[PDB]
């Protein structure tokens, strides 16, 4: 439906120095997920792994959680809840955990939680924060987008952002960053073209 609210998209690094990182994968036609620093935009395939890295200068307490949420980028669509198209809503798609209409899933984590906000109508997915490996600099979450940017009845060629928030056990904001996302068939190919846009 239509949300009444619009989520905040402002970058906020906060106490813990919270930032996002991405694999630098290139644009070889074979790559399924590649990020463009120029456009601050992730190019990913339908249902393929999209790794997103959490980087903190300071370790947040335990019980901290990581939420991901999609919104439309253009002003005239902001109040519209990003949601899978009817075809992929009805698809034999289920991973056993995720609601059939959420765009964003997390793979590899039985502690995942999915939320239909009963006041705003917004979809989000939440996982526990885990500190990096001893000897790693970052935490990695594997995200899946289950509906193409092309799908009419869904996003229908309108751009989206993903909003990653850091929250504490009670849900208070600890930090926030964001990136654009396009779910296509040719991520390597469509990034180099869009990076060719710009110049
Ligand atoms: Zn779809």
UniProtKB/Swiss-Prot annotation:
Changing residue 143 to N: In sporadic cancers; somatic mutation. This is Cellular tumor antigen p53. Changing residue 84 to Q: In a sporadic cancer; somatic mutation. Changing residue 1 to A: In a sporadic cancer; somatic mutation. Changing residue 154 to L: In sporadic cancers; somatic mutation; requires 2 nucleotide substitutions. Changing residue 154 to S: In LFS; germline mutation and in sporadic cancers; somatic mutation. Changing residue 98 to V: In a familial cancer not matching LFS; germline mutation and in sporadic cancers; somatic mutation. Changing residue 123 to D: In sporadic cancers; somatic mutation. The chain holds residues 92 to 290 of 393 of the full protein. Changing residue 102 to Q: In sporadic cancers; somatic mutation. Changing residue 197 to Y: In sporadic cancers; somatic mutation. Changing residue 6 to I: In familial cancer not matching LFS; germline mutation and in a sporadic cancer; somatic mutation. Changing residue 138 to N: In a sporadic cancer; somatic mutation; requires 2 nucleotide substitutions. Keywords: Acetylation, Activator, Apoptosis, Biological rhythms, Cell cycle, Cytoplasm, Cytoskeleton, Disease variant, DNA-binding, Endoplasmic reticulum, Glycoprotein, Host-virus interaction, Isopeptide bond, Li-Fraumeni syndrome, Metal-binding, Methylation, Mitochondrion, Necrosis, Nucleus, Phosphoprotein, Repressor, Transcription, Transcription regulation, Tumor suppressor, Ubl conjugation, Zinc. Changing residue 137 to V: In sporadic cancers; somatic mutation. Changing residue 40 to K: In sporadic cancers; somatic mutation. Changing residue 63 to V: In a brain tumor with no family history; germline mutation and in sporadic cancers; somatic mutation. Changing residue 67 to G: In LFS; germline mutation and in sporadic cancers; somatic mutation. It comes from Homo sapiens (Human).
């Amino acid at each position: 439906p239509l949300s009444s609210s619009v989520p905040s998209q402002k970058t906020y690094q906060g106490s813990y120095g919270f930032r996002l990182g991405f694999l630098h994968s290139g644009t070889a036609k074979s790559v399924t997920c590649t990020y463009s620093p120029a456009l601050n935009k992730m190019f990913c395939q339908l249902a393929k792994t999209c790794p997103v890295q959490l980087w903190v200068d300071s370790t947040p307490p335990p019980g901290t959680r990581v939420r991901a949420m999609a919104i439309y980028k253009q002003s005239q669509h902001m109040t519209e809840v990003v949601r899978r198209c009817p075809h992929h809503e009805r698809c034999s798609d289920s991973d056993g955990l995720a609601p059939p209409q959420h765009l964003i899933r997390v793979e590899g984590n039985l502690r995942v939680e999915y939320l239909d906000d009963r006041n705003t109508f917004r979809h989000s997915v939440v996982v526990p924060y885990e500190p990096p490996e001893v000897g790693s600099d970052c935490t990695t979450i594997h995200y899946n987008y289950m509906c193409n940017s092309s799908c009419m009845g869904g996003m229908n060629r309108r751009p989206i952002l993903t909003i990653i928030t850091l929250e504490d056990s009670s849900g208070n904001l600890l930090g926030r960053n964001s990136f654009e996302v396009r779910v296509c068939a040719c991520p390597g190919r469509d990034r180099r073209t869009e990076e060719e846009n710009l110049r």
